[PDB]
Amino acid sequence: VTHTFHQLLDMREPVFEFVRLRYLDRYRDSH
């Protein structure tokens, strides 16, 4: 397939993969 894409199709091989304190007391848990 690499040969087919490059030798005669003359293009890059396609590759894919499925992909599956005060101020800061208010921000933090402590308050």
């Binding site: 003359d10 293009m11 890059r12 396609p14 894919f16 499925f18």
Partner: peptide
Amino acid sequence: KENEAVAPEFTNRNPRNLELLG
């Protein structure tokens, strides 16, 4: 080379593509 352009994502439609892949 213009041919070098490739799409970002494939469009595989085979029902058993994933099944055969596992």
